């Protein structure tokens, strides 16, 4: 009984949380109550299997088991049309179909949170359901949220209430903590969405290269065979979480935190504070631990990778390992480079070897490969410098607007909401990274940009309208950012005419949150640029201002 095993390892509480998260991520439109019923029903079943490891159907894979309870509510086609086609399928296909149906932009009501009092009463009255509702709401809106970590957020959510409700000014104590949480949860969801996209659209080999680079940067002292071990386990974890095998992912993720803390000494002298913590805070702390100090006596890379004469042979013998070693070595000594840049470099090296080791004067051919790296390293450098400069002088809002204009002109066909969100996110990269000194700017900026452009790529892939987005999103995971940066203006784009129905003006615009005014004016700016692609940085201000001024007078007259 697979359930039995997982049950013993996670216990009842966490086991019940993971199953709810998994159902909420599969049937996103399904009501809360309905889910809870299925969960209990499944939990008890696991309980009867905990005793007689051969009852009714305890010798069934989780997929088989969960794929059945869901098909006892999804059958209702009038409710989840396509979902049903899935249940008519067999296994393991029955599972794939569901995964093909996860919705990155579920049409749902924005979670409005009542006054502090209503919440505190609800929390105090019944803690388990309050907590469960949170898990369900987050899970259905982010069908790829890293389950293990969602458990950690739930703990932080509980602790927020546990204290604010008891204190003097609850309002001022709760909101801040929940703001902090709403943001961090969106961030977390976006990063994980990139990991699943990597695994699902490009293959585990791409995910593995991403982890080697990232871990080597974080554990410069660790040994390649060690990093490689960590990378292999980490791959399985995410492979499972992304595929919906939430129980094993959580279970497997515990082991990794276990393993890493035991071997603390030979990995990083920074895990200390992480390892003397509870399970969930442990997993979490390790994932975000800062880079260790770089081993002081590290020989030039040129030695073993360009000057040596055994390059082609070692390459020939096992290119994967040799390429992995190149990345690990280059990465460990460049915590100042972004993970994607290191991957582009590793890609340039592999490409240079493929050609060079074919000619009969190898060493001479691949002798100046590091000169091919210079251009690749300064492009991101210039990009960041130029954009952080702009950011400093304009501030977040004005910067987001400049980006809205930039991107609408690049890919005008993209839906106004996606453009607005993506561009605001791109603007937050300016706020999060330009702060840092040049040494920490690139990993901050470019890896954050990869996360944000990944959103654009999954939102657009649902309803493709720009072959230019499609091309930049599917050609290569690592060159996405450079691909988008290179686009200027779509010259074949035919402008849109007018339509007052395109942008209603319901007076409810002097009543909405300040933040929501901006999002309205930005939604207007995008529509404006779509009508006048050729308009200019001069006239665009003229129509935005007057437009702002317009809503000013109007609102107070």
Ligand X SMILES: O=S(=O)(O)Oc1c[nH]c2ccccc12
Residues contributing to the annotated binding site for (4Z,15Z)-bilirubin IXalpha: 236
Is residue 384 part of the contact set for ligand X (CB under 6 A)? yes
Identity of the residue, 3 or 237, whose beta carbon is nearer to ligand X in the bound complex: 237
Binding to ligand X in span 199-238, by CB under 6 A: 214
The CB-of-407 to ligand X minimum distance in angstroms stands at 7
CA dihedral 199, 200, 206, 210 (to 10 degrees): -40
Q: In residues, how long is the chain? A: 557
Q: Which of 175, 306, 383, 394 binds ligand X (CB under 6 A)?
A: 383
CA dist 15 and 9 (Å) reads 9
In Å, how far from its chain's centre is CA 473? 15
Residue 472: both structure tokens together: 């930049």
Return the residue matching tokens 């453009």: 419
The C-alpha angle with vertex 250 and arms to 245 and 254, in degrees rounded to 5, equals 145
DSSP one-letter code for 269: T
The CB-of-403 to ligand X minimum distance in angstroms stands at 6
Is residue 340 part of the contact set for ligand X (CB under 6 A)? no
Is residue 394 part of the contact set for ligand X (CB under 6 A)? no
Binding to ligand X in span 177-196, by CB under 6 A: 191
Identity of the residue, 2 or 292, whose beta carbon is nearer to ligand X in the bound complex: 292
The CB-of-288 to ligand X minimum distance in angstroms stands at 6
Q: Which of 287, 346, 458, 483 binds ligand X (CB under 6 A)?
A: 287
**Can you say which residues are annotated as belonging to the binding site for Zn(2+)?**
63, 243, 245
Contact window for ligand X (CB under 6 A) among 59-67, 384-392, 454-462, 527-535: 384-392
The CB-of-447 to ligand X minimum distance in angstroms stands at 6
Contact window for ligand X (CB under 6 A) among 141-149, 156-164, 292-300, 423-431: 423-431
DSSP one-letter code for 277: S
CA dist 449 and 419 (Å) reads 14
The CB-of-126 to ligand X minimum distance in angstroms stands at 34
Identity of the residue, 138 or 190, whose beta carbon is nearer to ligand X in the bound complex: 190
Q: Which of 485, 524, 525, 527 binds ligand X (CB under 6 A)?
A: 485
Residue 306: both structure tokens together: 């360009």
Rounded to whole angstroms, what are the CA distances from 317 to 229, 274, 311, 323, 381?
21, 39, 10, 11, 35
| Total of chain residues touching ligand X, rule CB under 6 A | 19
556 C-beta neighbours (distance < 10 Å), count: 7
Residue 62: both structure tokens together: 């989780």
**Can you say which residues are annotated as belonging to the binding site?**
2, 9, 63, 236, 240, 243, 245, 248, 251, 255
Query: 343: closest CA among 378, 387, 373?
Result: 373
Task: Tell me the per-residue interface mask from 401 to 420 with ligand X, x by CB under 6 A, - otherwise.
Answer: --x--x--------------
Identity of the residue, 153 or 315, whose beta carbon is nearer to ligand X in the bound complex: 153
**Cβ neighbours of residue 28 closer than 8 Å, sequence gap 6 or more:** 102, 103, 106, 108, 140, 141, 143
The alpha-carbon radius of gyration of the chain (Å, integer) is 26
Return the residue matching tokens 């249940």: 87
Identity of the residue, 95 or 408, whose beta carbon is nearer to ligand X in the bound complex: 408
Query: 107: closest CA among 67, 130, 80, 134?
Result: 80
The CB-of-238 to ligand X minimum distance in angstroms stands at 9
Rounded to whole angstroms, what are the CA distances from 493 to 93, 406, 410, 501?
41, 15, 10, 22
The CB-of-33 to ligand X minimum distance in angstroms stands at 35
Q: Which of 342, 426, 477, 528 binds ligand X (CB under 6 A)?
A: 426
The CB-of-437 to ligand X minimum distance in angstroms stands at 15
CA dist 425 and 414 (Å) reads 16
Q: Is the distance from CB of 260 to CB of 229 less than 8 angstroms?
A: no
Is residue 245 part of the contact set for ligand X (CB under 6 A)? no
Is residue 239 part of the contact set for ligand X (CB under 6 A)? no
Binding to ligand X in span 437-466, by CB under 6 A: 445, 447, 449
The CB-of-469 to ligand X minimum distance in angstroms stands at 13
Give residues in contact with ligand X (CB under 6 A): 191, 214, 287-288, 383-384, 387-388, 403, 406, 426, 429-430, 433, 445, 447, 449, 484-485
């Amino acid at each position: 009984s697979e359930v039995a095993h997982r049950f013993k390892d996670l216990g009842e509480e966490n086991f019940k949380a993971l199953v709810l998260i998994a159902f909420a991520q599969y049937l996103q439109q399904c009501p809360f109550e309905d889910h809870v019923k299925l969960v209990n029903e499944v939990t008890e079943f696991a309980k009867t299997c905990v005793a007689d490891e051969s009852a009714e159907n305890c010798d069934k894979s989780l997929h088989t088991l969960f794929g059945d309870k869901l098909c006892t509510v999804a059958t209702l086609r009038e409710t989840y049309g396509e979902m049903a086609d899935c249940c008519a399928k067999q296994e393991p296909e029955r599972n794939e179909c569901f995964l093909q149906h996860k919705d990155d932009n579920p049409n749902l009501p924005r979670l409005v949170r009542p006054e502090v009092d209503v919440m505190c009463t609800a929390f105090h009255d019944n803690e388990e359901t309050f907590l469960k509702k949170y898990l369900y709401e987050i899970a259905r809106r982010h069908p790829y949220f890293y389950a293990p970590e969602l458990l950690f957020f739930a703990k932080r959510y509980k602790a927020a209430f546990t204290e604010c409700c008891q204190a003097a000014d609850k309002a001022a104590c709760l909101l801040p903590k929940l703001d902090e949480l709403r943001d961090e949860g969106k961030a977390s969801s976006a990063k994980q969405r990139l990991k699943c996209a990597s695994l699902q659209k490009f293959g585990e080999r791409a995910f593995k290269a991403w982890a080697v680079a990232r871990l080597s940067q974080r554990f410069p002292k660790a040994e390649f065979a060690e990093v490689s071990k960590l990378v292999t386990d980490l791959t399985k974890v995410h492979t499972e979480c992304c595929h919906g095998d939430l129980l094993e992912c959580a279970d497997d993720r515990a082991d990794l935190a276990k393993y890493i803390c035991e071997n603390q000494d030979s990995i990083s002298s920074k895990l200390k504070e992480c390892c003397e913590k509870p399970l969930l805070e442990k997993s979490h702390c390790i994932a975000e631990v800062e880079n260790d100090e770089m081993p002081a006596d590290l020989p030039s890379l040129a030695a073993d990778f360009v000057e040596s004469k055994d390059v082609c042979k070692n390459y020939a013998e096992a290119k994967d390992v040799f390429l992995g070693m190149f990345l690990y070595e280059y990465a460990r000594r460049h915590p100042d480079y972004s993970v994607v840049l290191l991957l582009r470099l590793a890609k340039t090296y592999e490409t240079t070897l493929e050609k060079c080791c074919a000619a009969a004067d190898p060493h001479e051919c691949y002798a100046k490969v590091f000169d091919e790296f210079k251009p690749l390293v300064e492009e991101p450098q210039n990009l960041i410098k130029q954009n952080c400069e702009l950011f400093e002088q304009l501030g977040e809002y004005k910067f987001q607007n400049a980006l809205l204009v930039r991107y609408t002109k690049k890919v005008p066909q993209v839906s106004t909401p996606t453009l607005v969100e993506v561009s605001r996110n791109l603007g937050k990269v300016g706020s999060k990274c330009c702060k840092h000194p040049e040494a920490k700017r690139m990993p901050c900026a470019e890896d954050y940009l990869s996360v944000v452009l990944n959103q654009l790529c999954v939102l657009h892939e649902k309803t493709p309208v720009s072959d230019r987005v499609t091309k930049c999103c599917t050609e290569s995971l690592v060159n996405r950012r450079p691909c988008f940066s290179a686009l200027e203006v779509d010259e074949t784009y035919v402008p849109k005419e007018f339509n007052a129905e395109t942008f209603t003006f319901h007076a409810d615009i002097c009543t909405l949150s300040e933040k929501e005014r901006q999002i309205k004016k930005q939604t207007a700016l995008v529509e404006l640029v779509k009508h006048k692609p050729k308009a200019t940085k001069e006239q665009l201000k003229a129509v935005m201002d007057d437009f702002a001024a317009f809503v000013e007078k109007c609102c107070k007259a």
